[PDB]
mmCIF file of C-alpha atoms in Angstrom:
data_model
loop_
_atom_site.group_PDB
_atom_site.id
_atom_site.type_symbol
_atom_site.label_atom_id
_atom_site.label_comp_id
_atom_site.label_asym_id
_atom_site.label_seq_id
_atom_site.Cartn_x
_atom_site.Cartn_y
_atom_site.Cartn_z
ATOM 1 C CA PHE A 1 78.983 91.753 107.623
ATOM 2 C CA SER A 2 81.141 92.497 110.653
ATOM 3 C CA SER A 3 84.755 93.370 109.790
ATOM 4 C CA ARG A 4 85.993 95.764 112.481
ATOM 5 C CA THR A 5 88.751 95.943 115.099
ATOM 6 C CA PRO A 6 88.206 98.722 117.651
ATOM 7 C CA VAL A 7 90.990 100.233 119.715
ATOM 8 C CA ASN A 8 91.714 98.216 122.832
ATOM 9 C CA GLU A 9 91.181 100.501 125.813
ATOM 10 C CA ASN A 10 92.220 97.965 128.433
ATOM 11 C CA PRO A 11 95.848 98.156 129.536
ATOM 12 C CA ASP A 12 95.524 94.863 131.414
ATOM 13 C CA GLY A 13 94.325 92.904 128.383
ATOM 14 C CA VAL A 14 96.217 90.685 125.976
ATOM 15 C CA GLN A 15 98.629 91.991 123.353
ATOM 16 C CA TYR A 16 99.027 89.737 120.331
ATOM 17 C CA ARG A 17 102.730 89.498 119.547
ATOM 18 C CA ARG A 18 104.467 87.064 117.206
ATOM 19 C CA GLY A 19 102.009 87.500 114.392
ATOM 20 C CA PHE A 20 101.838 85.100 111.496
ATOM 21 C CA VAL A 21 101.368 86.052 107.866
ATOM 22 C CA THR A 22 97.807 86.158 106.610
ATOM 23 C CA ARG A 23 96.745 85.388 103.064
ATOM 24 C CA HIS A 24 95.869 89.079 102.768
ATOM 25 C CA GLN A 25 99.287 90.102 104.035
ATOM 26 C CA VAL A 26 101.184 87.899 101.607
ATOM 27 C CA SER A 27 99.025 89.061 98.707
ATOM 28 C CA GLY A 28 99.671 92.684 99.629
ATOM 29 C CA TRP A 29 103.389 92.022 99.906
ATOM 30 C CA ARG A 30 103.507 90.301 96.530
ATOM 31 C CA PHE A 31 101.622 93.271 95.082
ATOM 32 C CA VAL A 32 103.873 95.949 96.537
ATOM 33 C CA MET A 33 106.870 93.923 95.387
ATOM 34 C CA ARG A 34 105.581 93.701 91.826
ATOM 35 C CA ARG A 35 104.906 97.435 92.030
ATOM 36 C CA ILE A 36 108.464 98.232 93.104
ATOM 37 C CA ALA A 37 109.740 95.925 90.371
ATOM 38 C CA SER A 38 107.626 97.739 87.791
ATOM 39 C CA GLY A 39 108.743 101.134 89.062
ATOM 40 C CA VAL A 40 112.372 100.049 88.805
ATOM 41 C CA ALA A 41 112.484 98.144 85.518
ATOM 42 C CA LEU A 42 109.948 100.437 83.872
ATOM 43 C CA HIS A 43 108.894 103.936 84.888
ATOM 44 C CA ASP A 44 105.339 102.928 85.670
ATOM 45 C CA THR A 45 103.715 102.646 89.048
ATOM 46 C CA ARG A 46 100.165 103.058 87.764
ATOM 47 C CA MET A 47 100.190 99.284 87.235
ATOM 48 C CA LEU A 48 97.456 99.321 84.575
ATOM 49 C CA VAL A 49 99.287 96.455 82.873
ATOM 50 C CA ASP A 50 102.224 94.533 84.328
ATOM 51 C CA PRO A 51 104.369 93.006 81.572
ATOM 52 C CA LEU A 52 106.795 91.618 84.153
ATOM 53 C CA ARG A 53 104.118 89.457 85.756
ATOM 54 C CA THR A 54 103.149 88.342 82.251
ATOM 55 C CA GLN A 55 106.732 87.321 81.489
ATOM 56 C CA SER A 56 107.088 85.392 84.734
ATOM 57 C CA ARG A 57 103.736 83.721 84.075
ATOM 58 C CA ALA A 58 104.950 82.837 80.581
ATOM 59 C CA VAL A 59 108.114 81.133 81.788
ATOM 60 C CA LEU A 60 106.167 79.276 84.459
ATOM 61 C CA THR A 61 103.653 78.174 81.824
ATOM 62 C CA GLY A 62 106.573 76.802 79.861
ATOM 63 C CA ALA A 63 107.616 74.874 82.955
ATOM 64 C CA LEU A 64 104.077 73.568 83.452
ATOM 65 C CA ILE A 65 103.962 72.400 79.831
ATOM 66 C CA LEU A 66 107.283 70.679 80.487
ATOM 67 C CA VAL A 67 106.207 68.779 83.581
ATOM 68 C CA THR A 68 102.839 67.925 82.034
ATOM 69 C CA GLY A 69 104.349 66.448 78.893
ATOM 70 C CA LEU A 70 106.805 64.602 81.108
ATOM 71 C CA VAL A 71 104.234 62.885 83.300
ATOM 72 C CA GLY A 72 102.045 62.279 80.261
ATOM 73 C CA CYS A 73 104.686 60.448 78.264
ATOM 74 C CA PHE A 74 105.603 58.656 81.505
ATOM 75 C CA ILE A 75 102.153 57.175 82.057
ATOM 76 C CA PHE A 76 102.039 56.550 78.311
ATOM 77 C CA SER A 77 105.181 54.430 78.570
ATOM 78 C CA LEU A 78 103.745 52.548 81.534
ATOM 79 C CA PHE A 79 100.212 51.844 80.308
ATOM 80 C CA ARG A 80 101.171 51.007 76.783
ATOM 81 C CA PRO A 81 103.076 47.728 76.164
ATOM 82 C CA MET B 1 120.414 158.326 109.603
ATOM 83 C CA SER B 2 118.876 160.698 107.090
ATOM 84 C CA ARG B 3 120.521 161.918 103.896
ATOM 85 C CA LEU B 4 118.018 160.748 101.298
ATOM 86 C CA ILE B 5 114.276 160.165 101.117
ATOM 87 C CA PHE B 6 112.725 156.830 100.186
ATOM 88 C CA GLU B 7 109.184 156.701 98.828
ATOM 89 C CA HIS B 8 106.774 153.973 99.892
ATOM 90 C CA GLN B 9 104.719 152.253 97.209
ATOM 91 C CA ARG B 10 102.839 149.005 96.768
ATOM 92 C CA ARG B 11 104.739 145.956 97.956
ATOM 93 C CA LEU B 12 105.537 143.382 95.293
ATOM 94 C CA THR B 13 103.170 140.503 95.857
ATOM 95 C CA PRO B 14 104.651 137.316 97.298
ATOM 96 C CA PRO B 15 104.311 134.142 95.229
ATOM 97 C CA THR B 16 100.808 132.765 95.634
ATOM 98 C CA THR B 17 100.073 130.524 98.602
ATOM 99 C CA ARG B 18 96.842 128.819 99.543
ATOM 100 C CA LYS B 19 95.197 127.645 102.756
ATOM 101 C CA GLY B 20 92.589 125.441 101.042
ATOM 102 C CA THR B 21 92.477 122.114 102.856
ATOM 103 C CA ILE B 22 93.358 118.929 100.978
ATOM 104 C CA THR B 23 90.988 116.060 101.627
ATOM 105 C CA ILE B 24 91.965 112.474 100.850
ATOM 106 C CA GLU B 25 89.718 109.518 100.165
ATOM 107 C CA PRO B 26 89.580 106.832 102.861
ATOM 108 C CA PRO B 27 91.403 103.603 101.968
ATOM 109 C CA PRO B 28 89.436 100.525 100.839
ATOM 110 C CA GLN B 29 87.772 98.402 103.520
ATOM 111 C CA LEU B 30 89.712 95.102 103.390
ATOM 112 C CA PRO B 31 87.788 92.791 101.014
ATOM 113 C CA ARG B 32 87.436 89.040 101.562
ATOM 114 C CA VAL B 33 89.100 86.005 99.987
#
């Protein structure tokens, strides 16, 4: 339900400096960064499909396959005689 | 001064301009996560 943040009308109140980074903020930053990257490498900003994110995901999936096979053969060496 | 007579006719129309306001949709309302 409630989501708001009215304007503070008190001059003697508290002002919240030194903000952190929210999950929302970091997601928005990652999005705008992927959008700039798309607009630079390609000439798309409509972002209907992002092949760059797919490529990065592909390389990281390769890395995950790597580390998974590694730990798998490791525990295989240990458990088996 | 005055040594020749110029005749006044319809001005050539300026390129079209418009006053019609341009509304913009309000941004999304910050979904959850």
